[PDB]
Design a protein around this ligand. Sequence first.
Ligand SMILES: CC(C)Oc1ccc(-c2ccnc(NC(P(=O)(O)O)P(=O)(O)O)c2)cc1
Ligand SMILES: CC(C)Oc1ccc(-c2ccnc(NC(P(=O)(O)O)P(=O)(O)O)c2)cc1
Ligand SMILES: [Cl-]
Ligand SMILES: [Cl-]
Ligand SMILES: [Mg+2]
Ligand SMILES: [Mg+2]
Ligand SMILES: [Mg+2]
Ligand SMILES: [Mg+2]
Ligand SMILES: [Mg+2]
Ligand SMILES: [Mg+2]
Lengths: 342, 342
Amino acid sequence: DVYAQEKQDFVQHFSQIVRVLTEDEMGHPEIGDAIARLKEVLEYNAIGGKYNRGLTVVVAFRELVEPRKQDADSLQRAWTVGWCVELLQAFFLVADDIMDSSLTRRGQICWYQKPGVGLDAINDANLLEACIYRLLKLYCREQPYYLNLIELFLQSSYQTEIGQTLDLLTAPQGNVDLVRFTEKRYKSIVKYKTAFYSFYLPIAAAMYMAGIDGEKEHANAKKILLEMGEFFQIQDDYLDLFGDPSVTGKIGTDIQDNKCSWLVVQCLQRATPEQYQILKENYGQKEAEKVARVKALYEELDLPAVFLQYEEDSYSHIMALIEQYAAPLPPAVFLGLARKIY
Amino acid sequence: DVYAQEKQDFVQHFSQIVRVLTEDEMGHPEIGDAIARLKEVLEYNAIGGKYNRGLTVVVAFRELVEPRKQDADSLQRAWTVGWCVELLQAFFLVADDIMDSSLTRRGQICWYQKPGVGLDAINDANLLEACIYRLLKLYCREQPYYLNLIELFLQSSYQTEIGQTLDLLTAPQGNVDLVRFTEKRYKSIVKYKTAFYSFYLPIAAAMYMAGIDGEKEHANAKKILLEMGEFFQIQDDYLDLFGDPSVTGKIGTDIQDNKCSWLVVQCLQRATPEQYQILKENYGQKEAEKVARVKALYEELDLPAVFLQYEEDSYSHIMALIEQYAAPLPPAVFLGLARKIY
Ligand SMILES: CC(C)Oc1ccc(-c2ccnc(NC(P(=O)(O)O)P(=O)(O)O)c2)cc1
Ligand SMILES: CC(C)Oc1ccc(-c2ccnc(NC(P(=O)(O)O)P(=O)(O)O)c2)cc1
Ligand SMILES: [Cl-]
Ligand SMILES: [Cl-]
Ligand SMILES: [Mg+2]
Ligand SMILES: [Mg+2]
Ligand SMILES: [Mg+2]
Ligand SMILES: [Mg+2]
Ligand SMILES: [Mg+2]
Ligand SMILES: [Mg+2]
């Protein structure tokens, strides 16, 4: 497993990230207290996950750049850029958890639920985003791909926030939205909210960093990565409800939050008129007993087994796309990622 | 007044901003609903203010670029970049209003307080930020100053969020923080939270757009603009409490929110031990009668008249800095802005 190999090292480079981001304090002591808060926000919200998106940059980089070109500086930039993807994720999750009324994340209480944090987390989240661009400037400003990386991170963020917009609009609090929960809609939501930043961005970044700038090469990689991202979000939805919370580190809120989840979409395709009514009466509400009825409806329709089959067909489909579209990139770049997610 | 001249026109270019930002809908109909939400967010949160920061870009641009170089394209870019500063402001204010528990902004209920919006405004706010970078790409990507503008907007945002961090840390809910409310601290907060983005950014952008890229020229402009921004935030603080809300369009929350306001700092410098105790018992709390005691303490110490004097000395001080530092830029660039704020 190429990720488990590169990980310890990736994770160790976090203290240098924090050191470099908290050196502004030297030039300007007056911002001491803010930088201290920044460190606390980084330590709490950037550590504790699996680091798959960040590690994808490092792994891809190693596989795409001739080993003679992997000097100490180039490696450090690679890890820095991986850490940029992780900071983007931490930005996103801190704000998402507020918007989804979540309780826990990565096995600890959500940053916004900490006493004395609350809605100040809005600013915390945006500070994490700003750190991305400070890191890129600090480590990559003289590199021919600098502008490419900046634009990629900006554009990936815009797309993801369009995603999030679709997510929120399809899931209004207090309104039954079952009619809106279609396969077509679901696929759009997850393409935008998840697939661009979690799959396309880290591989593209490593591509740019290796001087692979071509529009056709990016687009082919993209065909594979967006389908992988679709599956990853579908797995995420399944795990919100059926996942083991000691493994996931997070309590589910999709049913309560009236979300267009893969589960509810599959439910809707399979439900009798009577079960449609159970869903209609119970979905999108805070009451634990109403959430449990929805779960029981999902179990009665064998949705876990529908997911298991979907995982199998999807895996095959993605492997097919790797056969079609990897070239001229090493198939290993996509395979090691698929292994990681399936 | 060069602003009142350029305004109608600036404001008219907003429908083209919205048109260009909602054309993504052509390529990708699946994001139709999101783009529609984006339009509603822009219409609600980018219109209704005075447009001073955006207009500063246009005004400065006209004054800094030889009129033979002001072709239709260059003007359109100038107005576009002004609109970028306005979108940055709208981002900031939408999220700030959530964090400060505000009620109204620009004479209407705060976007987050609208029924059916609530904390979804977090995403709305970030979408406004993303629009900045999409506009820059769309209009300025081929210009020699593109990277300069991107970095300036990113860096200005980081600095402002460091500011906001200091603001929030100095003002914890439920804790007396009087000891922390010093002149030294106040000056740092406002330099970072207000002065960079509201004063330095729009003039710098116009500078870059005119090919004025030099470090010394930017730094001189900066000496003038950050002192102007300090005064603007001090005026903002005074107006939170003493301003006429039919003019300001916003209800004050500084005392309730336990803020390190210029008012409270001036109070602290002038208070007897007994008045110190009144402030200590009444500051930073939601109760209307406790807020009214604080106001009455401010009036008893003649703080409105202290502000009026400060406005006079500050104006003189800024004019002194214009005599020192404008050159080789036209003094009019700084004067027309000062007129606008004082
Ligand atoms: C500006 C900020 C609000 O933008 C975003 C913040 C978060 C996200 C996002 C994207 C993909 N997954 C998540 N979180 C998951 P998770 O909460 O981890 O299950 P989801 O809530 O979609 O089920 C968040 C997208 C955009
Ligand atoms: C990421 C986002 C939270 O960052 C910021 C959002 C807003 C601000 C900011 C800066 C300057 N003035 C304001 N608003 C004023 P106003 O509410 O308009 O009186 P303040 O609340 O400081 O008295 C907001 C700074 C940063
Ligand atoms: Cl699990
Ligand atoms: Cl007034
Ligand atoms: Mg969530
Ligand atoms: Mg969510
Ligand atoms: Mg989820
Ligand atoms: Mg405010
Ligand atoms: Mg504020
Ligand atoms: Mg204010």
